[PDB]
Tab-separated table of C-alpha atoms in Angstrom:
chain	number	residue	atom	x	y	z
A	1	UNK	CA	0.000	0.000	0.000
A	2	UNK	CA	1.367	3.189	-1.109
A	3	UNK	CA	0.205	7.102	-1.018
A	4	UNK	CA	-0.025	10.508	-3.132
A	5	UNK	CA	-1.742	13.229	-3.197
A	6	UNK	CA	-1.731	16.729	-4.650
A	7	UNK	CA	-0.323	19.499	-2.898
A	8	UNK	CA	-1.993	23.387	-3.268
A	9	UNK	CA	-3.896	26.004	-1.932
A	10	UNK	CA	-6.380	25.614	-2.412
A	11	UNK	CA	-7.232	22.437	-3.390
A	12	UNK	CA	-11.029	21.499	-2.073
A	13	UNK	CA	-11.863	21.100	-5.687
A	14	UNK	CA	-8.983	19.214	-7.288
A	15	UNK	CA	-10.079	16.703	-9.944
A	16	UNK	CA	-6.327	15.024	-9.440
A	17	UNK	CA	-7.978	12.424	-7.378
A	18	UNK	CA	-10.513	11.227	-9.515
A	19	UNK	CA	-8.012	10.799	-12.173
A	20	UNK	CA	-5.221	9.339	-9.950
A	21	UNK	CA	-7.651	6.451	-8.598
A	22	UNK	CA	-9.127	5.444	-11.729
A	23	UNK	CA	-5.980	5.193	-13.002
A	24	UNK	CA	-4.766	2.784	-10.033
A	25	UNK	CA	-7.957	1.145	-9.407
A	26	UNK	CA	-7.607	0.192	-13.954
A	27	UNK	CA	-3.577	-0.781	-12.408
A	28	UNK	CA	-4.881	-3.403	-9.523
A	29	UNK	CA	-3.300	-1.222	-6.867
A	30	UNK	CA	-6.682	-0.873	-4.837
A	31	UNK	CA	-5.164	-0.057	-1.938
A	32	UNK	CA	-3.143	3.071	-2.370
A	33	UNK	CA	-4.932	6.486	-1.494
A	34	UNK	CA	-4.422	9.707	-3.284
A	35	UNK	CA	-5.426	12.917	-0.991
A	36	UNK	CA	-5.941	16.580	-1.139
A	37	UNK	CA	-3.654	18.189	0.863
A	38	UNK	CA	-4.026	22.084	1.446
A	39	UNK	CA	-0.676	23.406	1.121
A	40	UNK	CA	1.081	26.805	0.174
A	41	UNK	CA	4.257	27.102	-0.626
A	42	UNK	CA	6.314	28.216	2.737
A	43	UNK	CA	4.695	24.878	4.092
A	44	UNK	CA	5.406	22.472	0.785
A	45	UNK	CA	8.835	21.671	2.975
A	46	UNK	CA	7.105	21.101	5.887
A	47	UNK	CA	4.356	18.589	4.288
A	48	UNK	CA	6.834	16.947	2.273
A	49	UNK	CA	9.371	16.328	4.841
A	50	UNK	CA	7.006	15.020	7.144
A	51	UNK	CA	5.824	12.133	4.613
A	52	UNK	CA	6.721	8.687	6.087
A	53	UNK	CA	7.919	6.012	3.499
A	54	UNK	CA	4.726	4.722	2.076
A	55	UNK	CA	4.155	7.969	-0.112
A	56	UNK	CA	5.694	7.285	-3.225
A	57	UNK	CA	5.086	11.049	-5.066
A	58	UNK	CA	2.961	13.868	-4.925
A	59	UNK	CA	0.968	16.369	-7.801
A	60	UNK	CA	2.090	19.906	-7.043
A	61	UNK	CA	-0.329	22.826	-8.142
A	62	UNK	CA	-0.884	26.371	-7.444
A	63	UNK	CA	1.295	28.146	-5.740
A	64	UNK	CA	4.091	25.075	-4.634
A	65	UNK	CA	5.223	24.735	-7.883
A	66	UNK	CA	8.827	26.908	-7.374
A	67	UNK	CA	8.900	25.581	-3.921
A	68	UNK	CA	8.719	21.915	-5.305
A	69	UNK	CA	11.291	22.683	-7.920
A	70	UNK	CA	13.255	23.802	-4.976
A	71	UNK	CA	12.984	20.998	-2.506
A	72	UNK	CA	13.978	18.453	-4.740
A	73	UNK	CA	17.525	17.007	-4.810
A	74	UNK	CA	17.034	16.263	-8.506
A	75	UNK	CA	15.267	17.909	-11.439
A	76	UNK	CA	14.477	16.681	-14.594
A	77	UNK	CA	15.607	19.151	-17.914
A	78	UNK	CA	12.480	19.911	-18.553
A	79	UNK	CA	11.236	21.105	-15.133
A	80	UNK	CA	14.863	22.722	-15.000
A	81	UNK	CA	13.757	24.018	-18.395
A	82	UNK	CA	10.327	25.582	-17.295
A	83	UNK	CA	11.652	26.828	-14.106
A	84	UNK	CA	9.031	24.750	-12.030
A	85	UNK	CA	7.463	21.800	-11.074
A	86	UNK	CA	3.964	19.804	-10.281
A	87	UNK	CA	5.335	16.812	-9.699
A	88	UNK	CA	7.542	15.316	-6.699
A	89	UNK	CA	8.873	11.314	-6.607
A	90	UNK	CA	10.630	9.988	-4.324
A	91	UNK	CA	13.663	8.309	-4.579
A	92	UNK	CA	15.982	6.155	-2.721
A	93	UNK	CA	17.948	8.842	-1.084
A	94	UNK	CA	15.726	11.874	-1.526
A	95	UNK	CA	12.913	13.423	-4.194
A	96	UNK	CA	13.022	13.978	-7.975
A	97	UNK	CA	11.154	16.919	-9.852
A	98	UNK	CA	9.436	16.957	-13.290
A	99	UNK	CA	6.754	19.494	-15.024
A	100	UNK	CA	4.238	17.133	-16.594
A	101	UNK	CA	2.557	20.451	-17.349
A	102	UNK	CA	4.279	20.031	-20.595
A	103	UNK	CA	2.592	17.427	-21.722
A	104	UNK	CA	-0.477	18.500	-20.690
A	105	UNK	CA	-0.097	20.934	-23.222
A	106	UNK	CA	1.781	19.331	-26.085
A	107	UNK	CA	-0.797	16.163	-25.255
A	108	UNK	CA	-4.301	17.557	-25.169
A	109	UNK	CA	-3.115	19.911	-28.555
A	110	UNK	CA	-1.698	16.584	-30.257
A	111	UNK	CA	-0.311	18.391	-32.614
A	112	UNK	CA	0.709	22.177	-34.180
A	113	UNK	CA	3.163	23.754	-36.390
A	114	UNK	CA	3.959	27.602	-37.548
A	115	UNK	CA	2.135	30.213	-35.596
A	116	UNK	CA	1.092	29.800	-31.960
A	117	UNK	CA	-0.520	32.568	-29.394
A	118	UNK	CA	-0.129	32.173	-25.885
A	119	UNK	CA	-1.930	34.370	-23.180
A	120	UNK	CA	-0.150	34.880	-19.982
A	121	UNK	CA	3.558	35.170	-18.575
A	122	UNK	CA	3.555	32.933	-15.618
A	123	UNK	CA	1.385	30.256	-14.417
A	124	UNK	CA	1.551	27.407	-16.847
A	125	UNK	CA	2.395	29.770	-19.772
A	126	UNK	CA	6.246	28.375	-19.962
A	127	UNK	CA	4.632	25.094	-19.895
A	128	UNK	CA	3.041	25.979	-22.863
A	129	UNK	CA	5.563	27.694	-24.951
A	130	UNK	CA	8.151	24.172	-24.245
A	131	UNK	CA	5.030	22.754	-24.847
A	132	UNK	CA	4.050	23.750	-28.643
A	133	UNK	CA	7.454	24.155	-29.552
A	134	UNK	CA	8.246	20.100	-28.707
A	135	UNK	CA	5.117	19.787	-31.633
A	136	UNK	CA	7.120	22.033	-33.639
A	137	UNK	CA	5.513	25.329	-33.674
A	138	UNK	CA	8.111	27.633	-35.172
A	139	UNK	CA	6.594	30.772	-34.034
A	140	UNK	CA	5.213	31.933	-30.666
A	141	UNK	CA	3.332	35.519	-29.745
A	142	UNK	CA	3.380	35.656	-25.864
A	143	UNK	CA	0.331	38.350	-25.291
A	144	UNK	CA	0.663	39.074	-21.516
A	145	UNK	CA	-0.039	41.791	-19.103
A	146	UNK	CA	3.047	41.608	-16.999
A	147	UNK	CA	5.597	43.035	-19.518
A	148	UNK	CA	8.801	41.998	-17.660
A	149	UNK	CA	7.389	38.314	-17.065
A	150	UNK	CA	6.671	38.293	-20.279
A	151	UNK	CA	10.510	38.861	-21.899
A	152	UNK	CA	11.598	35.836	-19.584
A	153	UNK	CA	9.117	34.083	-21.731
A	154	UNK	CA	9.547	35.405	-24.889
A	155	UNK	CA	13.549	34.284	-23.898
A	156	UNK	CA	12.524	31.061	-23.278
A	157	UNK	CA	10.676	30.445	-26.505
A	158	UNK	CA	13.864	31.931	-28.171
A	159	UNK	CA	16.265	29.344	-26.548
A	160	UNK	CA	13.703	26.076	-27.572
A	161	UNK	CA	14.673	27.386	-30.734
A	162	UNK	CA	10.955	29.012	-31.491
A	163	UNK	CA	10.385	32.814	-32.940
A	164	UNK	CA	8.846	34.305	-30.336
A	165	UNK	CA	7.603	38.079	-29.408
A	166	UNK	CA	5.443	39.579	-27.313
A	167	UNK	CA	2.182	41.521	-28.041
A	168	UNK	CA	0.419	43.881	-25.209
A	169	UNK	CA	-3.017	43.263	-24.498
A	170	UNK	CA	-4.127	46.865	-25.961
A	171	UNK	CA	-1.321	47.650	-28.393
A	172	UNK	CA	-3.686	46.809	-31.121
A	173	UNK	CA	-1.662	44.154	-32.394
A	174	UNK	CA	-3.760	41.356	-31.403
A	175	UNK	CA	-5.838	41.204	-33.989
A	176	UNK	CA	-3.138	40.774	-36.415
A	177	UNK	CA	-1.906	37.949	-34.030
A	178	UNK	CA	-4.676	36.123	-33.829
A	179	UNK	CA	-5.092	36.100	-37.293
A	180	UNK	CA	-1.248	34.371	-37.675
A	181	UNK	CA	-2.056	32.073	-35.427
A	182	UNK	CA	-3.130	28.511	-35.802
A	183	UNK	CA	-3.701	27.753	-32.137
A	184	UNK	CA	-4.423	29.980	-28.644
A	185	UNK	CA	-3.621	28.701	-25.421
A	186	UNK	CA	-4.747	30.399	-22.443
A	187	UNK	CA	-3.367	30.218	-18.547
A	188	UNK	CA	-4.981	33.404	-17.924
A	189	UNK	CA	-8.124	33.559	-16.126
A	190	UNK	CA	-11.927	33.393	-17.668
A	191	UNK	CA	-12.357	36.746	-16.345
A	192	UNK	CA	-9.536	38.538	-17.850
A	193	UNK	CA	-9.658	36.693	-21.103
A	194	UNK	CA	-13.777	37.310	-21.566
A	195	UNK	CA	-13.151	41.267	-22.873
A	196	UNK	CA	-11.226	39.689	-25.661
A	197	UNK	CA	-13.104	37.175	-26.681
A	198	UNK	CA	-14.630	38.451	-29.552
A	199	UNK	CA	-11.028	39.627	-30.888
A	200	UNK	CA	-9.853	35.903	-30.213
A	201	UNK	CA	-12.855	33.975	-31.236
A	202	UNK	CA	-11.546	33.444	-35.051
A	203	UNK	CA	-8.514	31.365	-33.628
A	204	UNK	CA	-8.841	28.213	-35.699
A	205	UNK	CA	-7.707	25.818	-32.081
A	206	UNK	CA	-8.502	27.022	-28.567
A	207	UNK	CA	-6.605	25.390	-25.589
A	208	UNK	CA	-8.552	27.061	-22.675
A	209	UNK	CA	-6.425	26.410	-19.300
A	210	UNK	CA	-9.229	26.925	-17.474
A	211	UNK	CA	-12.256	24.175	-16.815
A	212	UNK	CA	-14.157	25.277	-13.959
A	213	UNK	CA	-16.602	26.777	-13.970
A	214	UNK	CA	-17.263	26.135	-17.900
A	215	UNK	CA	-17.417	27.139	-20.124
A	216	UNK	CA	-15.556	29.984	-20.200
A	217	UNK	CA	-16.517	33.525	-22.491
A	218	UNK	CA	-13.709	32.815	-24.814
A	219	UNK	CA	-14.529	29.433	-24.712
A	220	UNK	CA	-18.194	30.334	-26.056
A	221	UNK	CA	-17.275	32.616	-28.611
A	222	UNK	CA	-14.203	30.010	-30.209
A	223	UNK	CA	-17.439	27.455	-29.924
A	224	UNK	CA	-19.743	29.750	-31.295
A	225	UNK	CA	-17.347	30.355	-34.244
A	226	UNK	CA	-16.901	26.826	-34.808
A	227	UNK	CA	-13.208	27.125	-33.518
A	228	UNK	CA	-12.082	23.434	-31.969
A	229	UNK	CA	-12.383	24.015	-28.393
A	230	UNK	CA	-10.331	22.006	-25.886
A	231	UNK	CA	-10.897	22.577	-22.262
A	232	UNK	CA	-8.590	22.887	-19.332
A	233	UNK	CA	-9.612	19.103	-18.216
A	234	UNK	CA	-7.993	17.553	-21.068
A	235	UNK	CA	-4.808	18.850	-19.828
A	236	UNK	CA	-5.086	17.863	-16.419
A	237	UNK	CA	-5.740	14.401	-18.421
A	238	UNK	CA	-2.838	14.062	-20.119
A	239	UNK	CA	-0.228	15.826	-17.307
A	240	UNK	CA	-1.391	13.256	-15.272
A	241	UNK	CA	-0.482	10.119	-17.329
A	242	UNK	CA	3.378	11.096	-17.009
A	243	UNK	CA	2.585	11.282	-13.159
A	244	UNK	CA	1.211	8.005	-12.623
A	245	UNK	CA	3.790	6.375	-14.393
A	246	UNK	CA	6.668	7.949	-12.489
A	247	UNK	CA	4.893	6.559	-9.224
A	248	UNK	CA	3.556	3.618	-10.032
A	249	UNK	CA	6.169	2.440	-12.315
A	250	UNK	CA	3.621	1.053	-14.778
A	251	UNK	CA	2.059	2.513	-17.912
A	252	UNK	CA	-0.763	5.114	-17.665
A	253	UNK	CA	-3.888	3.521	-18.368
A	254	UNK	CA	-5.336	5.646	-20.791
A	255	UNK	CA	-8.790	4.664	-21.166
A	256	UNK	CA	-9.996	4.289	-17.699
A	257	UNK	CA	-8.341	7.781	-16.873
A	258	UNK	CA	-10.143	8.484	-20.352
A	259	UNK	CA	-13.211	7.021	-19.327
A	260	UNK	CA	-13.094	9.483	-15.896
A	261	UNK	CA	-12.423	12.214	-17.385
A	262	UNK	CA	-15.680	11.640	-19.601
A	263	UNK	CA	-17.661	11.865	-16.555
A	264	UNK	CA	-15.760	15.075	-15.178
């Protein structure tokens, strides 16, 4: 019997569980538990530290994910890459950390090329700019609000070898970026993003971050325009696969995690 959990704050609403337990009830191990655990990011250390030997990893979100990066002894490339991470495993002598936020993005997209837009500078924007260039997007616009944020990101895309600028939100350039674009992801929140939906609603390929509550205004108006919408719980889905594997040592099992998903 073994344990995980997901670590945040807060963290009452999580859907990690539901996911996580499907996926090790489908793996015949019934008897591990997977818990919330409200946690900010001073007390990440404190939780963590305290875990006796039956945990075997824990999800990360909001607002651990430096302090996780942190803690760790070890870090994968990519989560050194990103600059955080949502996912801690344990290891013989101490804990290893990855950003399966990656794949959430580059997984519930499938796949992209040329022009990309993503909205936001922190969160799980970096995420997303590793993200669609590993699909092989050659070109990124980073519209953000936080101009300074923003040029770390634009830096990053440069260095995974993607074009990559940024746009203010009220330059009037985003028009013009949105019609470059083949795909928008978006880490900001519904609220800020719902003044721009109309300017954004042509995007051929939404990737909304956000799932709850749903859907969102931009989701409605992409929808509306017949835009493919993809919500916020397909990439919880697919950063999660990447998680169960790395603690249970066994492949995700993609259609029962599927199948729960579904009935999120």
């Amino acid at each position: 019997p073994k344990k995980a959990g997901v670590l945040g704050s807060p963290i009452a609403h999580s859907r990690s569980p539901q996911l996580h337990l499907a996926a090790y009830r489908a793996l015949g191990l019934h008897d591990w538990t997977y818990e919330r655990i409200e946690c900010g990011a001073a007390e990440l250390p404190v939780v963590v530290g305290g875990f006796g030997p039956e945990w075997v990893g824990v999800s990360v979100t909001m607002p651990g994910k430096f302090a996780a990066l942190r803690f760790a002894d070890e870090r994968t490339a990519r989560a050194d890459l990103v600059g955080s991470a949502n996912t801690l495993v344990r290891t013989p002598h101490g804990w290893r950390a990855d950003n399966t936020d990656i794949d959430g993005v580059a997984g519930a997209l499938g796949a992209a090329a040329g022009h990309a837009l993503v909205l936001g500078s922190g969160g799980t924007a970096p995420a997303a700019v590793v993200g669609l260039a590993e699909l092989g997007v050659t070109d990124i616009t980073v519209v953000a609000r936080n101009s300074d944020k923003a040029a770390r990101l634009v830096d990053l895309g440069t260095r995974v070898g993607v074009a990559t600028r940024f746009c203010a939100f009220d330059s009037g350039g985003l028009a013009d970026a949105v019609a470059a674009a083949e795909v928008l992801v978006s880490t900001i929140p519904a609220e800020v993003a719902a003044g721009y939906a109309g300017t954004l609603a042509a995007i051929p390929v939404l990737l909304d971050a956000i799932y709850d509550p749903w859907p969102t205004p931009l989701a409605a108006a992409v929808g509306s325009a017949g835009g493919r919408v993809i919500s916020g719980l397909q990439m919880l889905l697919h950063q999660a696969f990447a998680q169960v594997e790395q603690f249970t040592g066994l492949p995700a099992p993609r259609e029962a995690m599927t199948c729960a998903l579904a009935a999120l």
